């Protein structure tokens, strides 16, 4: 059984760059699975109208 | 195979 108007994904743990020690470096981040910041005023979950647009 | 019925592929939960 499947997600109808769910909102559980909002509680998902945030992302924070791991601070590296001195005399050591963290492995090289593959460009894959990387999210660009977007000045986003759009709603989320149930608050977002996911109905198809129209015109005229 | 036998007298009766083995009705496989019915339920998950």
């Amino acid at each position: 059984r499947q997600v109808s108007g769910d909102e559980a994904y909002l509680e998902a743990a945030p992302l924070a760059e791991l601070h590296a020690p001195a005399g050591m470096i963290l492995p090289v981040t593959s460009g894959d699975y990387a999210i660009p910041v977007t000045n986003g005023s759009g709603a989320v979950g149930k608050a977002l109208d996911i109905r198809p647009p129209a015109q005229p | 195979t036998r007298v009766g019925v083995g009705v496989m592929l019915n339920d998950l939960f």
Binding site: M24, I25, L26, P27, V28 | -
Partner: protein, 88 residues
């Protein structure tokens, strides 16, 4: 400990005697690769070091591990080798 059924746990790279005696100091990466095959682990923390862990433990005890550690430099040329046939 009991007398349970464990199914032989092989881990890492395979090393023969006839292959450890074949790398000499001052070879390239690609020369070591062809000599011993791609290593399974490598230090991804700012250091060209290669790990040839030839770990075997079969059924009940007798856990053999040979730890063959190879150090490279900025170039990509073997500088120092480190070989240990056991663990204590």
């Amino acid at each position: 400990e009991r007398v349970v059924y464990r199914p032989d746990i092989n881990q890492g790279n395979y090393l023969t005697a006839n292959d450890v005696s074949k790398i000499r100091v001052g070879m390239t990466q690609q020369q070591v690769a062809y000599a011993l095959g791609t290593p399974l682990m490598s230090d991804p923390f700012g250091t060209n070091t290669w790990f040839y862990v030839f770990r075997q433990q079969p059924g009940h005890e007798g856990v053999t591990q040979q730890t063959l550690t190879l150090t490279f430099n900025s170039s990509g040329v073997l500088t120092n080798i480190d070989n240990k046939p056991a663990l204590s």
